[model samples]
Target: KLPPRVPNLIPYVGSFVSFAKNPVQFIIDNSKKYGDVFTATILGKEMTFLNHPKILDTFFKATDNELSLRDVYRFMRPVFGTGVVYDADSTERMMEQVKFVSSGLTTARFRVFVDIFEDEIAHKVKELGPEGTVDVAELMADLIIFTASRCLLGDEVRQYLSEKNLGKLYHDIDDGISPLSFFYPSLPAPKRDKARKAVGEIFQELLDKRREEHKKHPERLLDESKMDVVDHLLTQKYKDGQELTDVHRIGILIAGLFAGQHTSSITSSWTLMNVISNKKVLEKVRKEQEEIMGSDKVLDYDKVMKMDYLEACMKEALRMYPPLIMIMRMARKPRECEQYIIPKGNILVVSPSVAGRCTDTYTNPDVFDPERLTERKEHEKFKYGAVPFGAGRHKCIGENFALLQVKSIISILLRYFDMEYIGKIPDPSYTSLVVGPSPPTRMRYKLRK
Candidate 1:
């Protein structure tokens, strides 16, 4: 049987306290006191926290027949629309859609977007005038947003980094995920309504423009050989054997655009903060850049992919501050594990941020160490230990694409300038579902000769 007091009523009081004050710390403390598996009553619902990777792996890999993302993400109805495959009830359709997304990422056409990613970052760095303090967090977010727009949305989509529309979209979409919405999403408060309005307007405009372009220049449309993600979806028939509606297209874009950039931007921000804060790591990263680029402003994708230190530094940052801190899965059928019964409909929360810090897997988890990943290649893939992109089917579909965008942005920034915290580094804040150093992460830097 499940542990006693799991569906504890008191957790309703505790949930708000924990979410409001500090979510990560609250989960860590609770796990320590109640063991790996415990429960918190959130918004009148009982949620079980599952710390074991094996159990999480089971959750992510479960067939839609046994479990579904719709159960949880239904809260996203207003945001993703009720028809989203991620929120669909059909088991066969969900599996097929998942496969379609996974296959789409591997196509050669998707690989061509790397040039656009590199060019956008290099251009943004040039505009920064070789360095004064700029909010690297916000800048990186904008870069990812614009890059994903061009790469995923195609050339017809008009997005320039100078435009604030993209930035606003990210902010509004993120703000929509607050604990308030997670529990009481139906509430028609100003914050929720305003955010929803902003997201809808931005997405509707983009979808309408794309449709018009396709109609006017049917022959000029992107070929599958050079098809972007949006194009791929337009070409495929949904499981219902019907064409994608404008709302359906917009829902997919929201999931891709919001999710595509948010975590990767934060991860890139953490990596930049670390490189600048620690002189030793900064110099080492520069040295690696010098060796790889050899004084050139740009390098091809093949060359960038070979830079081991760049990859290692990214892995370290992921270990230190993974963006998606925690994820939850609900069981559809009764299950038993670790001498405990997990009843159907119980929510299970999994946290990599906590597991990544365990000393048994990482020596001195608090220290900013990039070499650990390089030195311990086998351990880098440890089931529970270092899951930055997470593990298994529900694992982020755009991870490879995200890595490329992040690696390009950081590589370009380091080549053009050196960075350091301009004043005291502010305490990292968790807000609107993203955790990282706050804006005005004030920093000083100089142009590299």
Candidate 2:
């Protein structure tokens, strides 16, 4: 079963060790040693890593049907269950479901998301006090989780999850996506098992309740005026004209909430830390917000978007510490490229973390220079280089929605407060799935006079 070119290592041993130490550094070092296209065995299967930008674009742009997201989703199904698209095939019915989800991601909905985000950010800042020591990274995650829950579900559901044990369950499931969990997900490991059970029970309860609510209030369910993503999903017609089952609806809810919460939270945290540490950047962001927002008022959608420097700071933070640093795909069929042959069932890896820092594409990549991006339009269309939201169909459906939320949080904070790191610059700890400042990454801030 072994391909000659693929490196043979004990199952979950090589990658486990390397990834456990430093995932980004491990992958980058491996790519350099083994060439752009090479393989490593994980979970008893061979996976490849492809770093060339051109080849990555071709793969990313391929028809979603031709390439399966199953390998990745297979690991998730035990928790998310079968109704999620990742576990299903690309049938005409599946395509229809995808379209329905896409429709909810419209400009009007995004504008509403901006408003929701603004309200949540202001509330969070006030809750933390005008001046106090804060673990902004962890704080942002919890705040964004609530904000996403309210926007995508509803106030009742948000309140319900928070009050029930389900909130703790959701967090466990989130943690289970870490590198260690991915390699040995089904093990009777304490954290993994807890996460699995937590996810399963929470969704089962939420779905049963929501389905009853829909039947009793069909008018409320059908109206788009107060529509949430979950409402749109419940109305989605799957293949054979079947609507999603209660289980499937729950899966979509977790996936959508996860999409909105973690990535944006991490970026928002990093932007605040990096900007505040630099006197010039902090003053510039403050000035931009004041000029655009005017008269010491809270930030709104139009005013937030107009703060170009704020956007650039967020983008630069993304470049420096991308949430999903490396992406992996499993080859469904044998594929040959300039460098080598990728045998079927092997994995392919792409490193946006490395590509985003190319000097040729981004001047002074090491520096926090957000303005550098403004000089080049090429940055947006980059296929392989710097893919924060991913590429092609699998690209994050919530890109604009997520970015607006990040901008809102950063813009508002810069206007009324100043932050200082309570210790040395945080070396954010990286779990396999997401990256953020290690727990207790503290900072002290004071209200600007």
Candidate 3:
């Protein structure tokens, strides 16, 4: 039998209005009323919603033959572009890109990354001065791009941030993914289309220049230790001996920062907002840091790994406000799922936000409890309960780096400044593709004496 469909107030707009108002609670409320599996009509489309861990197991693990990412997440094309991610039609080709990209982020590479995060974060704090009221989300967006670009894209790419319009282009490209993009991703959009092409032009412009420069100074390319993801990508060759073509190269490289920048910014903002706002958590976090890091405040890969309490707070924030509120897949086969078969051609939706907050799984589900993961070990009870980065074969390749980077950002900020909310703390804004604190996520920063 097919999954039971939730009854609708309207003919075809079932669940759309409530979903738009608050998706995390909407799913949780219905999951209680309808059981773990239920169908909801959205804009004349049938979307299968999965709530429990076992269902997520099926949703995440299903191969493209069973459920397809490209079919469901096509709107990501503005950033991921034509030859990879949702744009790549062939699963093997997409997997190849995932493999190639992941290989660049070695454990050793993250050791190199911590210093850049430390330096980059400290410099931004200095520029902001001893005290100020600021938009924490926007501030984080600015800060994450710099550190992420420097670490992942290399020093040459870092310099592009100094260009007059590069950041705007990044923003415009990011703004490409509104709610409209979800439905009409293939449809033409003028400003975003222009921004997308412009970024490629700039990227290709720099790549060509580097090619010409490296011809004469080929000796400069010998330092493998200094190579970032972009540099590592240039040396890659597929099994057929063909290298990444210019178009694929652009898509692959931009895709590195597309998910990297926006998601990290939203997460870092939430992490800081939560940690800084909760005095008790912040105090304990600082105390935990004293034993692990102490006054010798230099951070590296090893130091970041050791701070269990602080990382727990960050993890908790991800549970409460995961940047990607929902992930979807299109069912390509009539899939067996418990008592129901999700028929072919339907969109399947899973929300990490809701999964993380299931009443059956988490005690006092609404409360923010960092120790829930670190001490109570509740997240381990259901493996899919806390997948802010995602789960299964397509789990985010940057999971390790993003977590490490946020740890570095938060710890270093605490090391240098004390912050408090400038106004009543902000609520999550879901207007954008990556949900974050509704802007005017304002905070006051006081430089440590």
Candidate 4:
């Protein structure tokens, strides 16, 4: 039998206002009213909302034949450019492309990345100086851009993108993606289009230059295990041993940079905000940092893995404010979600933001407690419960890299500065593509004495 659907009162305008204003709360309100599964007609399309952790897990487990990520997020083609990720030619091709990037983010690379992340954050902290107010959300956006660009794009592109230009170009892309942009991605925004093409041109010129550089200085070429993400993509081969075309490589290059950009920035801000907001949590975090990385203030992959409290803090922050507000998929064929059968062509949407706040998945869902996930083990009940990263086979590939980067940023920030988060943890600002802490998300700092 099909899941229950909430009928619209005014025909085609069904729940659009409420859903648009705050989709997270809208799903929660409806979940309480209609049980775990309910359908809402949104802009003339049927969307099934799943709430319960068990049902959320089931939805993630659905095969591509039953539910597809590309069909739902196909609008992202222009933003990420053509023929990568959701815009890739086929699902298998996309998986292969994702794999190429994942190979670069293994533990071997992360060992090196810990120093890179630390250097980036410690540098930004100096930029913040000893004692002024700055919006941590915006600050985080800058730091992640710098850090991810250096790590993922390789050193060449890092030099190519000026600090100001990097933020400027990335903002145009983020600004262009409003909530409504999902429904109307093709709408003309001349600035965004210009920026998109400008970024593509940057890749086009640089990739060729790098290939020649590697040829001229063949000794400089590193093994695949030693390469950065861009190098990994540059040298990848399909199963038939065909090298990636320039266009394909460029597409994936742009895709790789965009992957963790927003998600990590927003979550880092939340983690920072949450840590400093609570005295106990922040003290514990600093204590853990001192105990682990105190000597020489250095971190390696193995050492980073030992900082369990910091991981839970970031995970807890992600639990509070998931940058991907909704984990979405479209039903290619009818799919069963527990007792309910979703019809073909229906969109299945679950707000990780909403589901993360469920009582069944988390004890005191609104409470900011890292120990809940650790000492109490609240997150162990269900796989998808605290998962901000989408789940199952389609689970986000960048999660490990993203977490490692953020954790390092936090650990580094703690080591370098005496920080005090100003004001309460801001409500999430829903205006941007990635939901981040609402403005006046400020922090103050003095160098550690």
Candidate 5:
């Protein structure tokens, strides 16, 4: 038998409005009445929701052939370009691309990234100055874009941020990611196409220049101890003897930037807001930073990883306000969840927001408590219930880098300034592809005495 279906009154737009407006609340409300598994027609599509861990394990662990992500996320093709990620062949080429990107995020490489994060954070904080009220969301976005671009795309693209009108071009490309864009990516919505082409041209030019430089001085390129992702991709060769074109390189770079920047920024903003609001948590986090890093004040890759309390705070922030609320997978074949046999073409969904706030999964789930994550054995009991970055093979490849970036930025900011929330915490806005704080989220800061 199939799971209970969420009743809908409208003819074609069954449950679409409620789902679209606020999916996290919609899922929780339905799960309360209809049990953990339920079916609903959302925007002419049949979606089967699985809210329990037993079923979610199957959802995440299923093979790409059994559960495909490419179809669900094809909307990214316009911004990320073709022949990479969702647009590529899933079996051979896509996996190789994943390896190439993942290989570049090695520990050695992250050491370089930590230095980049520290330097960029210092520069941005100085620009903000000692006493000023600023929009935290916008500031975090700019900071992450700078850090990610420098570390992943190389210093060439990072240098362009200083040029007139060049930084806004990146922002325009980012503006292309919204709820409407998810459904209709190719639509001529203001600067969407123009920004995509402009950014792609910039990346293509960088790739060509790098290739010429490498050809001219192969030994110099070889002698470099740490190279960014662009350099790494240039050196990689597919096992099938297919040479990666400049278009492919551009696609890979954009995909990495798109995936890493927004999510990291959102999470960092939320973490800062949460810590500032909670006095005890903020004190403990600062204490941890002091004890671990001491007076040196220089954050390295290893030191950030060793800061346990800071990591807990970051995890708690992610749990309360996950960047992507729902994870969607299309069933390539019939699948079983609990007693029901899910038919082919059915969309299977698991929501991190709902699970993170479940009474069963967390103690006093509504309360924002970093202590829940501190006690190792206790929190490990419901590990799957708090998946902000997702789980299993299809989990975010940039998880390590994202965490380091967040930790490094937060650490540096806490060291330099005392942050204060200027207004009520903004609720999560789902208008974009990734969920982030609604507008008017402001914060004031002063230099720490």
Candidate 6:
């Protein structure tokens, strides 16, 4: 028999409005009444919700062929363009691309990126001046874009930032990935299309130049030792003997930056906000940072990883405000989740936000307590309980990168400045692809004396 369906009489639009407005709360409410598995209609699509760890494990562990991510994430194609991400062949070519991107972000490369991250953070901090108030979210968004672009896309693409108002262009491109776009991605939205076109053109131009350079100086291509992602993509070929075309290269880069951008930025902002609001947590993080790296020493990647308290704090922030409220997977074939049958074409949905807040998995789950992670293995009791970065084969590749980036940014900011929340703390806005603190999220700061 099918899983229990959320009773609604509006035909195709059943529970769509409620699910869209506040998905986290909606899932929690339904889970209480319907147990772990229940079907809800989202924009005419029937989605089976899997909230329990036992069921979610099966959800995450399912093979790519069994649960098709391509169909679920097809909305991203128009923004990321064709030949990459969800548009690529999932089983073979997509796995190769994942490996290719993963290879570029080794420990040694991350060490190098730490230096780049520090430099970028220092520059942004300096621009903020000795003391003033600013929109923390907006500031972090730009900083993440710059750092991700410089590190992932390489210097040529980053050069556009200095040459033009490319930051705004990046914002426009990012803004294109809204909830509305998920269902109607190809909708004739002027700003989204315009920014997407401009960003694509810029990346294409950069890729063309790199191709020209690679052809002219074949010897330079041989030096694999001094290569960034762009450089690697330019010279590398897939297992199928197909080299990534200019469009493919641009799509990959766009997808990378887009994946890293909002999640990291929102996480960094939430980390700071959480720490600042909870003075004890703030002190713990600051003390750990000082002990690990000292006052004057530069924070390297190894040192950043060693700060246990800070890591816990970041984890807590993620638990409290996960970037993606709901993780989705589509059933390509008949599947079973603990006696319930999830049929073909039905979408499987899980909520990290809901799982993270369950009282069974966490003590006083609503409270912002980093100590839960430090004190015990509460989250580990259930395999899928606290998966802010998700779990299994399709987990975010940039998880480590995002954690390091957020840690570095937090360390540097706290060391240099004293931050205090200005006005009421904002709630999480669910309208966008990733959930971030709502508007007017400002913070006051003063350079430590």
| lDDT computed for candidate 1 | 0.69
- lDDT by residue (1-449, candidate 3, tens digit) is 89888888798777688888887778878888988888988777788888888667888888988888888777778677886767885877788877766776878678888888887877797789999888888888888888887777667776677864688888888876687577666667678879889889877876776676568767656765576666656777876676787778778878888777888878888888888888899899889877877567588788899988888888888888888888888988888788888888889988988877776677897677797887888888877877888888899999888888888888888888889876665778878888888867888888987
Question: RMSD in Å for candidate 3, one decimal?
Answer: 1.9
TM-score of each: 0.88, 0.87, 0.95, 0.95, 0.96, 0.95
Cα RMSD of all models vs. native, in order, equals: 3.1, 3.4, 1.9, 1.8, 1.7, 1.8
- Candidate 4, which segments miss by more than 4 Å at Cα? 224-226
RMSD of 5: 1.7
lDDT of 6 by residue, 199-279 (tens): 888888887887787789778655543466788788789876867787877778778878878899999998888889888
lDDT (Cα, tens digit) per residue for candidate 4, span 1-449: 88887868668878788887888888999888998899998887888988887767667787777789889777877777777778888888888988887887877678778777877777776677777777887888888888887777676766666643756887886676677767776777788778878877877887878788778866655654457766776666987676788777877777777776888888888888888889999889888888886566467777788889999999888888888888788988888877768899999888888867988777788888988888889878877677688878888899989888898887877777788887667788778777887787878877774
Minimal lDDT window, size 10, model 3? 223-232
- For residues 1-449, what per-residue lDDT tens digits would candidate 5 score against the true structure? 98899888686678988888798999999998988899998767789998866568788888889998887888788778887878897656887887767777878778888889888987887787777888889888888888888888777776668874666876787776676654565676568668878887888788888888788867745544356778888988889787888888888888887887888999999989988988999889888888988768588878988988888888888878998888988898999888888889988899888887877668887777888877633356665777888899778898999889898888988888888997678889888778899998888888875
Alpha-carbon runs more than 4 Å astray in model 2: 1-16, 64-66, 89-102, 189-225, 376-383
Q: Each model's C-alpha lDDT? A: 0.69, 0.68, 0.80, 0.80, 0.82, 0.82
Greater-TM-score candidate between 2 and 4: 4
Q: Is candidate 2 or candidate 5 better by lDDT?
A: 5
User: Model 3 off-target regions past 4 Å?
Assistant: 212-222, 295-297
Query: Which tens-of-lDDT digit does each residue in 193-266 have in candidate 2?
Result: 56766666665766667768888888875565466766677666764766667766666666666766788998
Off by over 4 Å in 6: 212-225
What TM-score number comes out for model 2?
Answer: 0.87
Which whole-number lDDT from 0 to 100 does residue 150 have in model 5?
84
Question: How far is 334's C-alpha from truth in model 4 (Å)?
Answer: 1.4
